[PDB]
Amino acid sequence: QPEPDMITIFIGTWNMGNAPPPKKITSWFLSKGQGKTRDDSADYIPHDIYVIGTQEDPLSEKEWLEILKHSLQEITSVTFKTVAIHTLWNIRIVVLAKPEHENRISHICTDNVKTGIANTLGNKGAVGVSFMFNGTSLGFVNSHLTSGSEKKLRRNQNYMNILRFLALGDKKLSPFNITHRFTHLFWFGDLNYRVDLPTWEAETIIQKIKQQQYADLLSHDQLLTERREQKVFLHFEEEEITFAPTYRFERLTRDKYAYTKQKATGMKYNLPSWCDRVLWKSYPLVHVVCQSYGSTSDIMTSDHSPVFATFEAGVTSQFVSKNGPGTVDSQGQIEFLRCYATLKTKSQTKFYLEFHSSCLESFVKSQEGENEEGSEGELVVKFGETLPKLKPIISDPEYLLDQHILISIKSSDSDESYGEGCIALRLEATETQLPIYTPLTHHGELTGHFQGEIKLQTSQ
Numbered sequence: 001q002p003e004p005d006m007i008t009i010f011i012g013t014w015n016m017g018n019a020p021p022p023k024k025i026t027s028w029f030l031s032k033g034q035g036k037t038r039d040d041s042a043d044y045i046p047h048d049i050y051v052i053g054t055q056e057d058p059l060s061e062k063e064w065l066e067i068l069k070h071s072l073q074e075i076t077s078v079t080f081k082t083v084a085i086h087t088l089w090n091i092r093i094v095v096l097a098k099p100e101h102e103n104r105i106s107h108i109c110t111d112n113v114k115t116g117i118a119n120t121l122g123n124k125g126a127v128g129v130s131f132m133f134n135g136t137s138l139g140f141v142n143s144h145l146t147s148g149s150e151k152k153l154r155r156n157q158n159y160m161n162i163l164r165f166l167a168l169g170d171k172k173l174s175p176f177n178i179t180h181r182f183t184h185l186f187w188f189g190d191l192n193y194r195v196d197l198p199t200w201e202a203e204t205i206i207q208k209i210k211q212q213q214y215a216d217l218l219s220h221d222q223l224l225t226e227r228r229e230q231k232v233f234l235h236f237e238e239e240e241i242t243f244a245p246t247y248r249f250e251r252l253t254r255d256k257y258a259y260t261k262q263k264a265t266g267m268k269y270n271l272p273s274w275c276d277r278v279l280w281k282s283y284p285l286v287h288v289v290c291q292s293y294g295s296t297s298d299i300m301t302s303d304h305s306p307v308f309a310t311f312e313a314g315v316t317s318q319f320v321s322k323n324g325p326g327t328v329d330s331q332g333q334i335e336f337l338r339c340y341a342t343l344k345t346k347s348q349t350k351f352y353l354e355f356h357s358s359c360l361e362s363f364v365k366s367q368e369g370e371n372e373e374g375s376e377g378e379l380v381v382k383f384g385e386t387l388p389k390l391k392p393i394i395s396d397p398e399y400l401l402d403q404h405i406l407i408s409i410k411s412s413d414s415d416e417s418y419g420e421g422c423i424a425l426r427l428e429a430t431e432t433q434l435p436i437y438t439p440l441t442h443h444g445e446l447t448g449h450f451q452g453e454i455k456l457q458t459s460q
């Protein structure tokens with residue numbers, strides 16, 4: 001039975017509004033309703049992995065698992081295995097997988113982050129799951145961010161705290177946050193970004209939604225605007241939104257948006273908004289294709305509609321050779337030529353690099369680079385041809401060209417990372433000097449760039 005080179009992943013996010021679900025929720029797992037929907041001809045084909053994020057979830061873990069497994073069994077006639085379940089307050093993540101994947105999945109991690117301080121600590125935050133699927137690392141984050149149209153900057157702060165403090169994936173990747181630890185990272189939830197239009201325009205917005213004319217509303221969506229201005233979710237993708245706003249509905253119908261201020265809302269307006277979102281970030285040149293992104297029309301117990309997204313994702317096999325694992329393959333080498341980091345920092349410490357990759361036995365520390373002043377006020381750290389030659393565990397090009405090198409640039413004085421990035425080994429040529437590039441981030445904000453040339457030797 002051959003190992004897959006592709007899997008499909010279902011991501012669901014639903015703010016349940018503290019109410020039990022209706023008896024039938026299969027439309028969610030089938031990607032049916034509004035937006036980019038799944039073809040009827042696929043309905044019996046199970047996804048490989050189902051990741052369900054809930055917010056304001058009133059069920060026990062047992063109660064929800066029973067509903068989820070019974071839903072998937074009805075659709076697919078497959079009894080899914082539970083990979084992980086993790087709940088913080090009323091924020092929950094469930095990962096289910098086809099039974100045939102049980103002995104492909106390992107290194108399962110769970111964690112949560114509580115956002116806010118005092119007043120604002122006690123209900124918002126994020127839960128996450130990571131694991132290995134054969135050679136491929138997968139991370140999943142379900143966040144419920146701060147509510148309210150006038151709190152976009154709080155949501156951005158919540159995002160930065162979650163990506164700093166959520167402890168998933170390989171703890172040896174110590175310079176790297178969750179935005180660099182995974183081949184594929186899916187981040188979803190009630191992100192709570194709103195359509196930023198005046199309150200007086202509520203009925204106009206409703207009109208537009210009835211006409212399925214979303215363009216003038218999406219141009220005011222806070223998440224799209226904040227992402228365009230590089231304030232949040234830097235280097236993440238989101239499929240185009242072609243479904244109606246998923247909040248705030250009157251319960252038991254989808255015919256009415258309930259936007260007006262009420263005691264129950266703290267006298268806040270809730271103009272129709274795309275609160276409920278799925279974003280992802282995959283390593284460079286890895287196959288990832290969104291095949292659905294939409295909302296259900298027939299699940300009406302909450303003031304939010306459920307959102308679905310499905311993905312094709314490239315995966316690799318757990319490679320063994322006669323040499324690695326447990327030794328180097330001397331027919332393999334990675335040389336970084338004429339590399340330099342450009343940093344936004346005002347500091348004047350010396351810097352060194354760390355190269356991290358599961359194609360190495362352990363991470364590699366470089367010598368300190370040579371600091372120069374850049375023309376427009378920046379720091380340029382030059383590494384020349386000084387960088388250590390990297391010795392991969394396996395030389396086979398079928399393995400090595402699918403790998404990635406994570407780079408951290410660290411201060412000699414503090415050993416703290418000033419920037420993290422990633423280089424694909426999916427090159428146009430081997431034994432050939434080829435340009436490489438990554439942006440560098442720290443705490444998920446842009447701090448610089450790393451560019452140079454690479455020369456990759458494989459056994460072929």
Ligand SMILES: Cn1nccc1C(=O)NCc1cccs1
Nearest residue numbers: 081082083084085097101102105
């Ligand atoms: C026993 N258990 N309860 C909850 C989660 C688990 C678990 O560790 N499952 C391992 C699997 C890998 C793939 C399918 S199942």
